Design an enzyme around this catalytic site. Sequence first.
Site, PDB file in Angstrom:
ATOM      1  N   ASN A  11     116.122 -91.338  16.794  1.00 46.89           N
ATOM      2  CA  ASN A  11     116.464 -92.102  17.985  1.00 46.89           C
ATOM      3  C   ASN A  11     115.871 -93.507  17.892  1.00 46.89           C
ATOM      4  O   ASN A  11     114.757 -93.679  17.376  1.00 46.89           O
ATOM      5  CB  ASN A  11     115.878 -91.491  19.246  1.00 46.89           C
ATOM      6  CG  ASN A  11     116.562 -90.215  19.689  1.00 46.89           C
ATOM      7  OD1 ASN A  11     115.875 -89.279  20.109  1.00 46.89           O
ATOM      8  ND2 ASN A  11     117.898 -90.196  19.693  1.00 46.89           N
ATOM      9  N   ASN A  75     109.922 -87.050  23.864  1.00 42.71           N
ATOM     10  CA  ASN A  75     110.335 -88.063  22.913  1.00 42.71           C
ATOM     11  C   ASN A  75     109.683 -89.394  23.265  1.00 42.71           C
ATOM     12  O   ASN A  75     109.270 -89.628  24.407  1.00 42.71           O
ATOM     13  CB  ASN A  75     111.828 -88.176  22.870  1.00 42.71           C
ATOM     14  CG  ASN A  75     112.484 -86.983  22.186  1.00 42.71           C
ATOM     15  OD1 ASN A  75     111.801 -86.079  21.620  1.00 42.71           O
ATOM     16  ND2 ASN A  75     113.806 -86.977  22.219  1.00 42.71           N
ATOM     17  N   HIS A 159     111.562 -73.290  27.967  1.00 46.16           N
ATOM     18  CA  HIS A 159     112.306 -73.195  26.732  1.00 46.16           C
ATOM     19  C   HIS A 159     112.673 -71.750  26.417  1.00 46.16           C
ATOM     20  O   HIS A 159     111.916 -70.829  26.698  1.00 46.16           O
ATOM     21  CB  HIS A 159     111.440 -73.697  25.557  1.00 46.16           C
ATOM     22  CG  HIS A 159     111.113 -75.152  25.630  1.00 46.16           C
ATOM     23  ND1 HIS A 159     111.919 -76.122  25.068  1.00 46.16           N
ATOM     24  CD2 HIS A 159     110.082 -75.802  26.223  1.00 46.16           C
ATOM     25  CE1 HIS A 159     111.392 -77.309  25.318  1.00 46.16           C
ATOM     26  NE2 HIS A 159     110.283 -77.143  26.020  1.00 46.16           N
ATOM     27  N   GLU A 208     119.517 -79.363  25.480  1.00 45.44           N
ATOM     28  CA  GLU A 208     118.496 -79.792  26.433  1.00 45.44           C
ATOM     29  C   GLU A 208     118.901 -79.562  27.853  1.00 45.44           C
ATOM     30  O   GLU A 208     120.057 -79.772  28.210  1.00 45.44           O
ATOM     31  CB  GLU A 208     118.169 -81.274  26.262  1.00 45.44           C
ATOM     32  CG  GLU A 208     117.654 -81.559  24.857  1.00 45.44           C
ATOM     33  CD  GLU A 208     117.468 -83.046  24.543  1.00 45.44           C
ATOM     34  OE1 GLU A 208     117.340 -83.879  25.517  1.00 45.44           O
ATOM     35  OE2 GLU A 208     117.468 -83.335  23.325  1.00 45.44           O
ATOM     36  N   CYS A 217     114.641 -83.120  19.960  1.00 43.08           N
ATOM     37  CA  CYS A 217     113.905 -82.701  21.141  1.00 43.08           C
ATOM     38  C   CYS A 217     112.564 -82.177  20.647  1.00 43.08           C
ATOM     39  O   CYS A 217     112.415 -80.999  20.254  1.00 43.08           O
ATOM     40  CB  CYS A 217     114.658 -81.603  21.911  1.00 43.08           C
ATOM     41  SG  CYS A 217     113.779 -81.198  23.451  1.00 43.08           S
ATOM     42  N   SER A 219     109.700 -81.364  22.131  1.00 46.36           N
ATOM     43  CA  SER A 219     109.115 -80.202  22.765  1.00 46.36           C
ATOM     44  C   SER A 219     109.839 -78.910  22.388  1.00 46.36           C
ATOM     45  O   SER A 219     109.218 -77.843  22.369  1.00 46.36           O
ATOM     46  CB  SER A 219     109.062 -80.346  24.290  1.00 46.36           C
ATOM     47  OG  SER A 219     110.359 -80.334  24.803  1.00 46.36           O
ATOM     48  N   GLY A 220     111.121 -79.023  22.100  1.00 47.17           N
ATOM     49  CA  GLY A 220     111.917 -77.897  21.602  1.00 47.17           C
ATOM     50  C   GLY A 220     111.364 -77.438  20.275  1.00 47.17           C
ATOM     51  O   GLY A 220     111.231 -76.225  20.040  1.00 47.17           O
TER      52      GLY A 220
END
Length: 274
Positions: A11, A75, A159, A208, A217, A219-220
């Site tokens: 990103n 992020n 999650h 997400e 992602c 945290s994913g």
Amino acid sequence: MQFSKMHGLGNDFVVVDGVTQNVFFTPETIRRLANRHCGIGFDQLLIVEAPYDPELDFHYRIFNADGSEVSQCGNGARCFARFVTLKGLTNKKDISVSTQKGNMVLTVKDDNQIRVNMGEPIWEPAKIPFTANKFEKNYILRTDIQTVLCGAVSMGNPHCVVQVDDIQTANVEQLGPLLESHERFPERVNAGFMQIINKEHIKLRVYERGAGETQACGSGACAAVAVGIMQGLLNNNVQVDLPGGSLMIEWNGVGHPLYMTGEATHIYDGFITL
């Protein structure tokens, strides 16, 4: 308004010092600045702000190119740390920051990579939140087209993690939406699809919460590794390959915080009127 352009995990970010400048953006303005042909062009906009809390160094917010504030993925954390370092907003090696969802501690490593302390994973269903009789390592979730097995965990956001044989052919397109708004996740969920290569290496895609699939992602990635470790399928240090880049996740199990390490790169500095 001064800004910097950076990238991390596939990103590109616009990063703004909102501590020494007073900035506020409406969605309309954000979309205009995000436009690649008539604006600056970015996937994510990151504002570094005062913490309004003597126990923290900074607060940061992130906005998507549609102009909404978002906070599922963590992020920009690596870019945040590099930016505040490069710009002299701090010279601390361990930086404490609040976000919309939970605090982080950012460590600027000797090799310049950034390690982010994401806190201890949360497993109790009611605290995720997730509707279940009791904790299980694998939960059975029925959808319209398939019954899947998943781990469930919270890192600040909920999650669920489904293991898949082949990350490119996993049915993220149909299963993602069905899991993201599954009835058993009262506040919705980030639906991760994980291919385990070996005990120290996975590939991951994430649908997400409120957004669908993007290039990354973080945290994913944290959640998937926590789940895999909990399940006995992964070791305590694991490389995660997201579509846009890779992270190293470290977690020594219950009682310990989980860490995420990755790169952030400075591209250029800019100045814009408005």
